[PDB]
Ligand binder design. Structure first.
Ligand SMILES: [Cl-]
Ligand SMILES: [Cl-]
Ligand SMILES: [Cl-]
Length: 124
């Protein structure tokens, strides 16, 4: 039901904050974006830039995706991001996440018309 583009926005966009300020940021966002519903999503990255800046990456540096596909693009500049990763003590449904704030380049897979981000590959 959800389109691939809408799923990318829901799972990775957080333009309301400029950076994760507390170590509780991941637990609250993974829950409110509904990523801990049927299970604890193990890893998830949130980008704190406007949707227009993230969408613009689809017209930046064309690179290979880890999967070998070639519709991945690397942002020319670094972006504010938050890495959310389950801790060794996380147990559905008591999902526990480690919050790691950083500033790096993002790599995303783009598709469609319009040509927008549909998958978050990695950050460098
Ligand atoms: Cl859409
Ligand atoms: Cl939802
Ligand atoms: Cl991710």
């Amino acid at each position: 039901k959800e389109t691939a583009a809408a799923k990318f926005e829901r799972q990775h966009m957080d333009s309301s904050t400029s950076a994760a300020s507390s170590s509780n940021y991941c637990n609250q966002m993974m829950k409110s974006r509904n990523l801990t519903k049927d299970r604890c999503k193990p890893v998830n990255t949130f980008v704190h830039e406007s949707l227009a800046d993230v969408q613009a990456v689809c017209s930046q540096k064309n690179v290979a995706c880890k999967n070998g596909q070639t519709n991945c693009y690397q942002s020319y500049s670094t972006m504010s991001i938050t890495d959310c990763r389950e801790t060794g003590s996380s147990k559905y449904p008591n999902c526990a996440y480690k919050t790691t704030q950083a500033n790096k380049h993002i790599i995303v897979a783009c598709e469609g018309n319009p040509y927008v981000p549909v998958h978050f590959d990695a950050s460098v």
